[PDB]
Ligand binder design. Structure first.
Ligand SMILES: [Mg+2]
Ligand SMILES: [Mg+2]
Ligand SMILES: [Mg+2]
Ligand SMILES: [Mg+2]
Ligand SMILES: [Mg+2]
Ligand SMILES: [Mg+2]
Ligand SMILES: [Mg+2]
Ligand SMILES: [Mg+2]
Ligand SMILES: [Mg+2]
Ligand SMILES: [Mg+2]
Ligand SMILES: [Mg+2]
Ligand SMILES: [Mg+2]
Ligand SMILES: [Mg+2]
Ligand SMILES: [Mg+2]
Ligand SMILES: [Mg+2]
Ligand SMILES: [Mg+2]
Ligand SMILES: [Mg+2]
Ligand SMILES: [Mg+2]
Ligand SMILES: [Mg+2]
Ligand SMILES: [Mg+2]
Ligand SMILES: [Mg+2]
Ligand SMILES: [Zn+2]
Ligand SMILES: [Zn+2]
Ligand SMILES: [Zn+2]
Ligand SMILES: [Zn+2]
Lengths: 196, 89, 57, 151, 48, 229, 61, 129
RNA sequence: CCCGGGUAGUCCUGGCUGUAAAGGAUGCGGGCUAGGUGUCGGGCGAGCUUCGAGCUCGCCCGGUGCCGUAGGGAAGCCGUUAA
RNA sequence: GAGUGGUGGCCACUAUUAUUGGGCCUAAAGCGGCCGUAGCCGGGCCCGUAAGUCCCUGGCGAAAUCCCACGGCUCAACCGUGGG
């Protein structure tokens, strides 16, 4: 039914949005509280995580790029790349990484994962130019422009980002057949998150 | 009004000194041993008039248009410029 | 023979030579190819797989 | 927009589309005509009669019944009053505007320096003359009728 | 400025009057029709 | 076509590609020019065009549209720069336009030719004139427009044998694309050559934006890219 | 959807507290609504929706 | 104020197609708008359409398919004779048989191709291509 | 130009004059074409409340600002308060 | 090229007169503001009329001048017989 119980989703704060809203995000929004804060629907998150796990398992592993400027997302993307074999770029994204072949670390992926369209704007801009599919994590305040596959979640919290990337890595492993069952994946969620 | 005035049968170039046109016309003048430019221009005009009649007859319809259409083809094959089975295009 | 010009899955217009379009296999089933033109991507138009019926960006 | 002030207000009524009277309305046409005559004899305007009928008697507009005499048309309050001889001699909107203009003119006799209110009198009299042109065209006013404040 | 006017099917007279009115703003047209050059030419219109 | 085939062979074997599309071309997974368009690829290596369309390196298929010298002011005098506008094509259905800069004319010419290749486009050709309905790809298939700066350009289908009724810059560009006859109308400052050329190039590109039906393809003789007898 | 205009007001079936008479009245009046039998007040008008002083029995279509 | 219901409808359709709308509502309806829509549907420029009844002059709901380059009214409504269609085609259309001019005749509303086949003139009211 | 004085005028009543960078340097009416975020008036819903014509959040209509997508423009820039 | 230059005029160039087809925030250009007469432009449905409008057919708009084919001057310019 669910990849994890809804209690863990709620305790990790996946459903907590922001005081701002956007017209194209309303298909994912569940309700608004009395203090003006918008809440996300968690069943949609589970469905999109399953679909995203199926989509990403079909690409060649070293052709996947994951990025995260925001500090609370840096350890999760590094751990995701270590587990799945995907390239991972935490911190400042050097302009021209995907458009300037003369640069030392020039790299053209086949698919890109964006932690936040607002903060990772340089990576998204360069990815539009080279015509690859874009997968993104979207909060209540984000727009859906140039997003080809959207995953609705809180993308600012430490525990939520840890949980999202942990689930996504497990789904990829299960879908490509490197683990024969879900129970086999014995890597705790706490290893994806930043400490202190 | 004004009575009739007899008009030139040939047209002059819109600009006297264009390099490409000068080269092309010099080649023609040398090859066919024509006496002056106007002689060449005369023949050019004849060609233009033929094309202008075909362009007008393609976009026409009715009874006089057909008669004119067949007269143009007949005259062109009498002069030997088209074979016996040619069409308007 | 000649070649076929690709057509956007959402709106059905042809893809022009140098626009910022994209194409990918269906995320849900993987049996069909989705094309999205620059205008549909910019406005976040929804799309629907012609085989399994899963819809949306 | 508003004829002179050029504002774009939108408030108004939102009538649902329907043909017959609703099932829950029990009054017949004869009761409704009797009510209209009684209210008019109490001294109300045609707009006020409809307001009272809607608010107190639960009657959405009388324009839900066919005219018992002429099947070509529906019933209106003015048509009902005409059928009994109690219809206004001057059209009501013109009458209300003329009444507003008379009150304002005696204010201006005592306040000759109140120029902003005078422009209001000018606008009101423009409205009055538009209406008199329309009504003479339709034959609801005699051809010799004229508007003169000194009357 | 709104749409250029008049565009109506039965507004021929006004359109013609508009074109006539603003043609006098063209100094070429005004000088020819009023014959201003002839009025001041010492050669009286001659080429030599 | 015997020369440029071996030129393409020579370029291919001594070339080490630095981009993904260049690798697809190097390994024989792409063999035709039409396969690089309409999928969002970034084109950053000039060797791609040299292998797939080798005839853009001929002298008859290149035109230097204009050369200007521009000035930057300093406390030690005037610093001079060259700007070159150039175009290339295959005279069938592919055309490109580029701008180059340099301290000497030759550097600017080299860079301008290089950028024209990288800006290559494919167009549509046909016959749409009321007074010539011949289904051959000698003109534009229908009326189109383009613009740049103050310049507006409108291109109109013309009869076979008319010639190119347009200013000289437009003549050169249209000839490189493989079009023989056209009518035209312009607004704005055509003496600004950079803008004139860009407006014509945009008009040619815009033949891809008109919606058409299968019936229309037969009626106007529409051809995409090479005529391909 | 909202192409057709639909009102936000309603007609209500109410019962007088004092007389016991039953009536049908409008929810957004512009006058004081009084009982058709005894004359007691049933709805007081305001800027928008009226203040109902009677017992509401049914909301009519 | 409102002067021309048909011009509003066609400008509305051309604005909507440029941003990828899948349907539109034409707010003041009339019989002439209905005839124009029937002709547009016959040549494949629109999908299904339906009349919706308010208490007012009615509404049209129309399905769009992204097949319209441009559409607009012709003002004033010029009269035209049965053998004079070509110059109007060159005025409003991009190639010799590209698109349709919509004509009001005493035999009804029809495309200029059908009217030319019947041998009749009329009044120009719209163009679509 | 700065400093010490100073007539007309600046103020009220009844008239005349009809001029300003009287500038939003942008004539007026109607239909249509992504969003986001403040603020003023009215209405509706919900929750608080010291029960106040009080406070907080959301939505509709009409005013008044800012950022900005398509499109426009020589550009500065305008962008449902359209240029 | 038996011609080729100078001076003055009209058309084009010129979408620098704009019906087709131009402009008016900062470049020439929105009356300081508003009310309203003539004129122009005007919401949906049903029935009648037939002035505008479209189609068919009678009587007219001299000849010369213009376009096409054929014929006579060696061909042509020119002139005749037919069609427009
Ligand atoms: Mg005489
Ligand atoms: Mg210095
Ligand atoms: Mg530009
Ligand atoms: Mg100019
Ligand atoms: Mg003093
Ligand atoms: Mg002031
Ligand atoms: Mg100011
Ligand atoms: Mg002014
Ligand atoms: Mg408020
Ligand atoms: Mg105000
Ligand atoms: Mg507002
Ligand atoms: Mg802005
Ligand atoms: Mg101008
Ligand atoms: Mg003004
Ligand atoms: Mg007025
Ligand atoms: Mg009407
Ligand atoms: Mg008649
Ligand atoms: Mg004659
Ligand atoms: Mg002889
Ligand atoms: Mg002869
Ligand atoms: Mg003769
Ligand atoms: Zn699309
Ligand atoms: Zn599928
Ligand atoms: Zn042709
Ligand atoms: Zn009672």
């Amino acid at each position: 039914e669910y990849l994890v119980p809804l209690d863990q989703y709620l305790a990790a704060g996946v459903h907590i949005g922001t005081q701002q809203k956007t017209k194209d995000m309303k298909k994912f929004i569940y309700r608004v509280r009395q203090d003006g804060l918008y809440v996300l629907d968690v069943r949609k998150t589970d469905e999109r995580l399953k679909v995203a796990g199926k989509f990403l398992a079909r690409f060649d592993p070293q052709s996947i790029l994951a990025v995260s400027v925001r500090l609370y997302g840096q350890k999760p993307v590094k751990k995701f790349g270590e587990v799945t074999g995907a390239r991972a770029i935490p911190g400042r994204f050097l302009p021209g990484t995907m458009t300037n072949p003369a640069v030392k670390n020039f790299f053209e992926p086949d698919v890109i994962i964006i932690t936040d369209p607002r903060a990772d704007h340089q990576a998204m801009k360069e990815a539009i130019e080279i015509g690859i599919p874009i997968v993104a994590l979207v909060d209540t305040e984000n727009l859906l422009s140039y997003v080809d596959l959207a995953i609705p979640t809180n993308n600012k919290g430490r525990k939520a980002l840890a949980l999202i990337y942990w689930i996504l890595a497990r789904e990829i492993l299960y879908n490509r057949g490197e683990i024969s069952s879900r129970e086999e994946f014995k890597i705790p969620v706490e290893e994806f998150e930043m400490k202190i | 009004g004004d009575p009739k005035r007899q008009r030139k049968k040939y047209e002059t170039p819109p600009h006297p000194w264009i390099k490409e046109r000068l080269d092309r016309e010099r080649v023609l003048m040398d090859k066919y041993e024509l006496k002056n430019k106007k002689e060449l221009w005369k023949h050019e005009t004849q060609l233009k008039n033929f094309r202008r009649r075909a362009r007008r007859l393609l976009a026409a319809r009715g009874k006089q248009a057909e008669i004119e259409r067949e007269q143009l083809l007949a005259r062109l094959k009498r002069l030997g410029l088209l074979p016996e089975d040619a069409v308007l295009d | 023979l000649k070649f076929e010009i690709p057509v956007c899955t959402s709106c059905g217009r042809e893809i022009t030579p140098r626009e910022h379009a994209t194409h990918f296999v269906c995320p849900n089933c993987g049996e069909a190819i989705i094309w999205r033109c620059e205008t549909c991507r910019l406005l976040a138009k929804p799309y629907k797989c012609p085989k399994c019926g899963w819809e949306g960006p | 927009a508003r004829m002179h002030a050029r504002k774009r207000g939108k408030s108004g009524s939102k009538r649902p589309p329907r043909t017959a009277p609703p099932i829950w309305l029990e009054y017949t046409v004869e009761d409704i005509e009797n009510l209209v005559v009684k209210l008019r004899k109490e001294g109300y305007s045609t707009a006020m009669i409809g307001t009272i009928l809607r608010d107190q008697y639960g009657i959405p507009t009388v324009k839900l019944f066919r005219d018992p005499d002429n099947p070509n048309r529906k019933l209106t309050i003015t048509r009902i009053l005409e059928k009994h001889g109690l219809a206004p001699e001057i059209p009501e909107d013109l009458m209300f505007l003329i009444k507003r203009a008379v009150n304002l003119r005696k204010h201006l006799e005592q306040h000759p320096k109140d120029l902003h209110s005078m422009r209001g009198l000018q606008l009101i009299e423009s409205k009055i003359r538009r209406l008199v042109k329309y009504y003479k065209r339709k034959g609801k006013l005699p051809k010799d009728w004229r508007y003169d404040p000194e009357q | 400025p709104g749409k250029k006017a008049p565009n109506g099917e039965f507004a021929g007279r006004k359109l013609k009057l508009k074109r006539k009115k603003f043609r006098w703003s063209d100094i070429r047209y005004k000088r020819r029709v009023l014959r201003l050059k002839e009025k001041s030419d010492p050669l009286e219109g001659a080429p030599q | 076509s015997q020369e440029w085939k071996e030129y393409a062979k020579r370029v291919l074997d001594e070339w080490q590609p630095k981009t993904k599309l260049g690798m697809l071309v190097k390994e024989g997974q792409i063999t035709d020019i039409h396969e690089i368009f309409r999928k969002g690829y970034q084109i950053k290596e000039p060797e791609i065009i040299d292998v797939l369309l080798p005839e853009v390196n001929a002298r008859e298929n290149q035109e230097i549209l204009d050369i200007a010298l521009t000035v930057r002011m300093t406390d030690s005098g005037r610093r001079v720069r060259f700007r070159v506008l150039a175009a290339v094509g295959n005279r069938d259905g592919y055309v490109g336009l580029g701008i180059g800069h340099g301290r000497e004319v030759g550097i600017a010419i080299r860079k301008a030719i290089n950028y024209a290749k990288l800006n290559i486009i494919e167009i549509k050709r046909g016959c749409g004139s009321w007074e010539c309905r011949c289904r051959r790809p000698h003109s534009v298939p229908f009326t189109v427009e383009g613009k740049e700066g103050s310049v507006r350009v409108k291109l109109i289908p013309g009869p076979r044998g008319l010639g190119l009724v347009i200013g000289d810059v437009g003549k050169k560009i249209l000839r490189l694309a493989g079009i023989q006859d056209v009518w035209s109308q312009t607004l704005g400052e055509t003496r600004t050559t950079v803008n004139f050329a860009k407006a014509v190039f945009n008009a040619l590109y815009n033949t891809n934006k008109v919606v058409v039906t299968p019936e229309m393809i037969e009626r106007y003789g529409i051809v995409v890219g090479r005529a391909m007898p | 959807r909202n192409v057709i205009p639909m009102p936000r007001s309603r007609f209500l079936r109410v019962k007088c507290i004092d007389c016991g008479n039953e009536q049908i009245v409008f929810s957004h009046p512009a006058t004081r609504v009084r009982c058709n039998v005894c004359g007691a007040t049933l709805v007081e008008p305001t800027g928008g929706k009226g203040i109902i002083r009677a017992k509401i029995l049914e909301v009519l279509e | 104020t409102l002067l021309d219901p048909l011009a509003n409808a066609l400008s509305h359709i051309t604005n909507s197609e440029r941003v990828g709308k899948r349907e539109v509502y034409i707010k003041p309806a009339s019989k002439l708008i209905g005839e124009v829509l029937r002709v547009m549907q016959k040549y494949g420029y629109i999908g299904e359409f339906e009349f919706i009844d308010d208490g007012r002059a009615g509404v049209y709901r129309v399905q769009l398919l992204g097949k319209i380059n441009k559409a607009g009214a012709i003002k004033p409504r010029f009269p035209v004779k049965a053998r004079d269609y070509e110059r109007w085609e060159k005025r409003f259309l991009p190639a010799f048989e590209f698109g349709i001019l919509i004509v009001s005749t005493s035999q009804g509303v029809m495309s200029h191709k059908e009217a030319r086949e019947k041998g009749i003139g009329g009044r120009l009211i719209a163009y679509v291509y």
